[PDB]
């Protein structure tokens, strides 16, 4: 059960920047995003914990350079419990299977 | 009915941190989460009341240590009424039945 | 047409506490809850007006003891009009029929 | 087209109070409500314009007397255009046809 | 491709007033409304640009006289691009075809 | 992958103004919009990076000239990753294929 990383920002441009920087910085899979409310958006990624760590640093840096975006909150869980993956939207899916493989 | 615990924070990373810490700290089942609005998220758990208490303390501590997350509100109900379980999203489901058995 | 009681708080933990205290304090049926927006939640109950009054007092007290919850607004209508029950989500349903009977 | 009245408050208890007072005060039909966002709720009524006026005054008074509720905005349109009735949620429906006949 | 006008206010009563004033002031079609979030509502209309201009003035005046309503933002586009009409909800539909004809 | 541009404003009239100015200023395709919450709207465009840049400048100028609208945030990604296009709503669709061909 690979690590999960999650980041949230105000505004969609910021989450787009975060997502592109994250997948290019580490061997990770973007497994989903959330329209969280109040114009906040969440991005969730999976991979080896070191890859998630590097991607997260790059996603934070990308948001901070995006005009009008700000990092609100973020976390990395190295070994998420099966119950967590079953309930929260952080599991894999066929749409992202091509990018799990390369990862 | 087994006890129910509920915790709410601003932001999804905080509820993810709470969820993982809670299920690792006690013999509980995560039965659901809520996108509450205004970027707040709710997590609901079930189990024996002492296990829920231990899990809740671990969930609060996890949120406190998560950047940008704060505990907004929480509660533990030791013996929720059947009408409450039937109307509010705190009941078990097939998706979490493997974790109820392990917990139970 | 039995009385209707409605209470709203900030946060789901508060509405869970209110709902449990209300059904245990009076011979009432919880007929629904609303995700009202802005993290506010509504609970609606039905029963004899005296039972709704007692339940409401217990629901208010429960919210006030819940960490981080606050009562935003509440009302009791003793004899709601049929047009009100038809349009607003305060009618009974099969999911709650078991608890209407005992009530 | 019969007149339309619309009232909005913060919180569902307030719109419940307005709804009951309005239909009891005048020969009107409640045709719908809206979860408007930010915990605001809208109620829309129809009927003869004098009946809508009497109902609106009773709805405002009910909200004023409901704890935690305040009247945010309201309007009465005496003769709404057919294109308005067709696009906005202010038309009658089978669910309220028994109350339109009683009102009419 | 006829002009499009868009107006947004806080509260549904204001958008109802705007919509009625707009269709009565000009030879326009109301093509939709949006629950935009935060209790804001959008109204979108189409027609000859001069008709849209007159309707918009009447919709603004109607909102300003509605108790508790306020104009938040508005725009008129005289000749909207086909790509805009395809993506944004400002095109015609069967529900409003009767009122396009008269217009 | 062609470049992606994204812009966000408060209110729908502002995103309508941005959309029209953007597609008229550059060889771009509008691929979608988002009702982001809190009355904010997002517009997403695709095309060659120089065309996206020209369009973005025109979109910002349009929003600046629209009453009650302000540019809240925007970005341009020259070469978005395939996993980004597959998960976020920035890909082409049949609805806009006539405008992709004209743009391409």
Author numbering:
A (entry chain B), C (entry chain B), E (entry chain B): 4 to 106
B (entry chain A), D (entry chain A), F (entry chain A): 4 to 107
Sentences from the study reporting this entry:
The crystallization of K3/K4 hetero-hexamers was next attempted. We opted to increase K3/K4 abundance by means of pIsep-FPLC, a chromatofocusing-like purification approach. In that manner, the presumed His4-tagged K4 homo-hexamers could be removed, as indicated by the WB analysis of purified fractions that proved that most of FLAG signal was eluting with the second (most abundant) chromatographic peak. The pooled fractions collected for this peak were used for crystallographic assays. A condition resulted in a hexagonal crystal form diffracting X-rays to 1.80 Å resolution and displaying two molecules in the asymmetric unit. The only novel feature was the observation of a 2D arrangement with similarly-oriented K4 hexamers, which therefore differs from the stripped organization described before for the same protein, and provides an additional proof of the high structural plasticity of BMC-H proteins. CcmK3 absence in crystals prepared from samples of K4/K3 hetero-hexamers pointed to monomer rearrangements occurring during crystallization. The crystallization of CcmK4 from CcmK3/K4 samples might also point to a higher stability of homo-hexamers. Despite formation of 2D patches noticed in some experiments for K3/K4, the assemblies were smaller and less regular than those obtained with His4-tagged K4 homo-hexamers (right), which basically reproduced previous published results. In comparison, Tm of 89.2 and 62.3 °C were measured for K4 and K2, respectively, whereas fluorescence readings with the K1 homo-hexamer changed slowly and weakly with temperature, which prevented the determination of a Tm value.
Bacterial microcompartments (BMC) are protein-based organelles that encapsulate enzymes participating in a given metabolic route. Thus, high resolution structures for several dozen shell subunits from different BMC types are now available. These data, combined with sequence information, confirmed that whilst differing in enzymatic contents, all BMC shells are built from homologous proteins adopting two structural folds. The first one (Pfam00936) is present in proteins that are organized as hexamers (BMC-H), and as tandem domains in subunits that form trimers (BMC-T). Here, we investigated this possibility by selecting the four CcmK paralogs that compose the shells of carboxysomes from the Synechocystis sp. PCC 6803 cyanobacteria (Syn6803).
